[PDB]
Amino acid sequence: TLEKFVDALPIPDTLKPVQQSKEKTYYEVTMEECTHQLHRDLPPTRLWGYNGLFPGPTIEVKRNENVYVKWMNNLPSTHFLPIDHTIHHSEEPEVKTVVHLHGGVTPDDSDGYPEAWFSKDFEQTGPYFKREVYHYPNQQRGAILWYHDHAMALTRLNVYAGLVGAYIIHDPKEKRLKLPSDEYDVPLLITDRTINEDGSLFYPSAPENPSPSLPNPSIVPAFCGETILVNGKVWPYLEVEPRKYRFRVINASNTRTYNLSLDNGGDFIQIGSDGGLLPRSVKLNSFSLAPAERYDIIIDFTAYEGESIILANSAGCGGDVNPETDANIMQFRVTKPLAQKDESRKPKYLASYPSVQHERIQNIRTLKLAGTQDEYGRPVLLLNNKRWHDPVTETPKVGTTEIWSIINPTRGTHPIHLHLVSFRVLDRRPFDIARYQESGELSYTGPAVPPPPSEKGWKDTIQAHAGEVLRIAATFGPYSGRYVWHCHILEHLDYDMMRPMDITDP
Ligand SMILES: [Cu+2]
Ligand SMILES: [Cu+2]
Ligand SMILES: [Cu+2]
Ligand SMILES: [Cu+2]
Numbered sequence: 001t002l003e004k005f006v007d008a009l010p011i012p013d014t015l016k017p018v019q020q021s022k023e024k025t026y027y028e029v030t031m032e033e034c035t036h037q038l039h040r041d042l043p044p045t046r047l048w049g050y051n052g053l054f055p056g057p058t059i060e061v062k063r064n065e066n067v068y069v070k071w072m073n074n075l076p077s078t079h080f081l082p083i084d085h086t087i088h089h090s091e092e093p094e095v096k097t098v099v100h101l102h103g104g105v106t107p108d109d110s111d112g113y114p115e116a117w118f119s120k121d122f123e124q125t126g127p128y129f130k131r132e133v134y135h136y137p138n139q140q141r142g143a144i145l146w147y148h149d150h151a152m153a154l155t156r157l158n159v160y161a162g163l164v165g166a167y168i169i170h171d172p173k174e175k176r177l178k179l180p181s182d183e184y185d186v187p188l189l190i191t192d193r194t195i196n197e198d199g200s201l202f203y204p205s206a207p208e209n210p211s212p213s214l215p216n217p218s219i220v221p222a223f224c225g226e227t228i229l230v231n232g233k234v235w236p237y238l239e240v241e242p243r244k245y246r247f248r249v250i251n252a253s254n255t256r257t258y259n260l261s262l263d264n265g266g267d268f269i270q271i272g273s274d275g276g277l278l279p280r281s282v283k284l285n286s287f288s289l290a291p292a293e294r295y296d297i298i299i300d301f302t303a304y305e306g307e308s309i310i311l312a313n314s315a316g317c318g319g320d321v322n323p324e325t326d327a328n329i330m331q332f333r334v335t336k337p338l339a340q341k342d343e344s345r346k347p348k349y350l351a352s353y354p355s356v357q358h359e360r361i362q363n364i365r366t367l368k369l370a371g372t373q374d375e376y377g378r379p380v381l382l383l384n385n386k387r388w389h390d391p392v393t394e395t396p397k398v399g400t401t402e403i404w405s406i407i408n409p410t411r412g413t414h415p416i417h418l419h420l421v422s423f424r425v426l427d428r429r430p431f432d433i434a435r436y437q438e439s440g441e442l443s444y445t446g447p448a449v450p451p452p453p454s455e456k457g458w459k460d461t462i463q464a465h466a467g468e469v470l471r472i473a474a475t476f477g478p479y480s481g482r483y484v485w486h487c488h489i490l491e492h493l494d495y496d497m498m499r500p501m502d503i504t505d506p
Helices: 155-161 172-177 433-439
Strands: 025-036 045-050 059-062 067-073 099-102 133-136 143-149 164-170 185-195 227-230 237-239 244-251 258-262 268-273 276-284 286-289 294-300 308-313 328-333 361-373 379-383 401-408 414-418 423-430 461-464 468-475 481-487 498-503
Touching: 045 155, 099 133, 143 155, 143 244, 143 294, 164 185, 164 244, 227 328, 276 294, 379 481, 401 414, 461 468
Parallel strands: 025 067, 059 164, 185 244, 237 328, 361 401
Antiparallel strands: 025 045, 067 133, 099 143, 143 164, 185 227, 244 294, 258 286, 258 308, 268 276, 268 294, 308 328, 361 379, 401 468, 414 461, 414 481, 423 468, 481 498
16 A cells, blocks of 8 residues: 655645735636646546646635635546436536535525536536626635535536635634634645556446446445545645644545544644634544534644654544554644744634524424435435425525424434535434334434534534434525535435525515
8 A cells, every 4th residue: 555654745825816906806716637646656646626736726715805716617528537327317518517615605606506517618507507707705704614516416526536625714803812823724635535556546437346237337325535635645744843733624525534533642622613613612632524524623733842643533434444544644743843933822712602692493494314226226315305306395584593403314424514504503312213214203212412512613514423313503694595405425415415405585
């Protein structure tokens, strides 16, 4: 296997605007097929990248900054990864793209609707396409966001190809907290990959030892990569100064959940979740990170000068974790001389509690994670046993607050994501799976459990564990329009665990 910790961690450059005034910031980002070396010992890999980079450029904005991004497709007309033609039926181009700013408080036509896709130079566009230049008003809490492809029936492929990047909203009001900043504030985009000897990406064309009933290529219900990359390098190292760093930890993997720790037994300090700063900082020895979740953390290397510390992983993917491979994420080497005094802080008091809000519960929505089997014998994962194309059923009214009760009778965790909003986690409660499957009756096998401190802030992607009912609360706004909610396991999303979400203005 590839030698661990021989390549330095890339830190994507911050994107520069094409035009900028006090009133408007204008960016251009072009999707390009490009080649990059992923490891010292590999030939360069063919990838799809925003501005031809993997990951794409980091975009940094201020809260309330009036931002526009013209996301453009300059990709080849044929994919290099295996397309399953059976999972969607519409004339249409093979390669479709659309960019979703994950966590963005964004008008619907700029949100990256799956059917708002476009081909090269916008030659062909999906039925819900409205505009070329996306508008991000950024009227939301400072937070770690990220952007990635969201094209109908292609998300697992386009994201795997390399179409992911970081987007950070800086609230000037947070500067007084003196959190680690500038070179001491570093995004970590974690992506698992399987790479062939010739350097080319491997993505399966079919399930392992496929049934003759299956089409070719065929979608698979999960992908587990043999290798872990951070910021587009296999098992990299980062030289750090002996001081406090802020890391924006982003799970940009298709399926894989990580459970992260430091191999010396040191602690993280979590300061933020998907939706921004937690009300209080939280000292953690480990944390779970499912696809699309973000942890905003401080690691304090002050007492560890000279040491090599591995960011380790205990969560398996399709089996037990391998100590020599996927148990490793990256290695910190505390060997960089201090550039200046560490004047950063790790404050306890960060933000207002979500519980300060006292919104009336307009609706309680009961939702189940289910599915069926297709003509080829493959599982089709479905929210409420409804297909993507079935008439919309999740229709919250703008400005109103709802409780969503997510029932998971399946065998695994699904990281559920709602567009537009960030939400509060209320509780999780275990139930009798067999009784639910047989009668549809919900019988609890234990008391409700409140969220861990890590989930007492704002979330937009939430782990709904097997055999539990998860309750969340969201205020639907400030915009009305057509959005989506879905599982962020991309192999599930594409077939067919995604539903429209209409925020209405009556
Ligand atoms: Cu996403
Ligand atoms: Cu999203
Ligand atoms: Cu799922
Ligand atoms: Cu989405």
